[PDB]
Amino acid sequence: KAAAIGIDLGTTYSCVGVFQHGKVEIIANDQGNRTTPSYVAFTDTERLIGDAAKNQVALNPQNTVFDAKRLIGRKFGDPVVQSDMKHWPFQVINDGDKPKVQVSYKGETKAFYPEEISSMVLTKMKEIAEAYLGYPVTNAVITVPAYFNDSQRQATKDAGVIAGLNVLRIINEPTAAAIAYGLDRTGKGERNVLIFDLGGGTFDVSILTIDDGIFEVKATAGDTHLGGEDFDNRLVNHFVEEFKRKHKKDISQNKRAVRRLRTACERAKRTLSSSTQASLEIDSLFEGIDFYTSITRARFEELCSDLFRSTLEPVEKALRDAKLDKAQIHDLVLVGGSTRIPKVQKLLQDFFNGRDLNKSINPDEAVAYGAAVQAAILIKSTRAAAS
């Protein structure tokens, strides 16, 4: 039979779902993870995609590519492109005003278009889904941010085609989230939805009006450089400082020690979303000194207090652009793992005067969930048109 997948092709991570037997299934990668890093590493012997690629990033920063979504469908002259480049460890070259990522692969200089890199992350998703199902899967719905332009949408589709997928539809990330919560099935009238998407490196606020199951993007706001990784950095600086206080040694200049500490802060942070305390357990952090310490939710919330506050401004702007009051938003949808942070949920909840938030579906997987729902609907429709 004709099966179809839903793929959330995220900036930092990608997720893949399939609607089957009246239920959505989010497919774990061979490593068992329900999301896969949007990383592509070129080494001296092989092309690594997903976790394997991310794991060796410290070791091979120059030829490990991430953030291709920042560059997809963009011109090389784009201001965003020019700014973003200064912060990447891999080379970006200009070809016909089209950005290309130049790396070292099997001892040779090779350049790739952003859609080529994305096509590789989509192949990993196409494969992950085929490993689960037991047969090849090509029909797919791929999601993109609502603000994405036509050039950006075509490049994402181009990546899907290169990856060997028949792209059923390119649908907006916030639309997919609403679909996941079946907000396009509440019947007649207008339904105002606000999507609060906080990722690892981007923040997106989207307001949609769903009238008779039809979706309209009323406003889009956010920070392209704000997310989970900033909270991580706040923890890193707190702990670099703590180390100095405890041992009178500055570990900041040691690339390995700060990377190992960053890794530990990202894990401690996650633990904090579900518990009051989190303990770091780093063996021989710097100069053979183990770093076994603890942090509290309260202290973490303090180290990030201003950052959490900033999320609300984008929300206020979206309300103005959409010409709506706080009371006019029917549903609040959380997307992105960072929305698991209780302070963030509390801040959003307080802003909307105690309104319950849609958070039952995993925030990390809501988009892939909605995309898998749409893929099934479209595949059925395309097939039903045939016979």
Ligand SMILES: OC[C@H]1C[C@@H](Nc2ncnc3cccc(OCc4ccccc4)c23)[C@H](O)[C@@H]1O
């Ligand atoms: O690129 C994805 C974002 C989301 C962050 N995840 C989380 N942040 C805060 N609390 C969490 C609590 C439980 C689970 C989380 O995320 C798990 C995860 C890890 C990696 C990718 C997707 C989801 C959390 C993650 O650390 C990263 O900053």
Ligand SMILES: [Cl-]
């Ligand atoms: Cl699975």
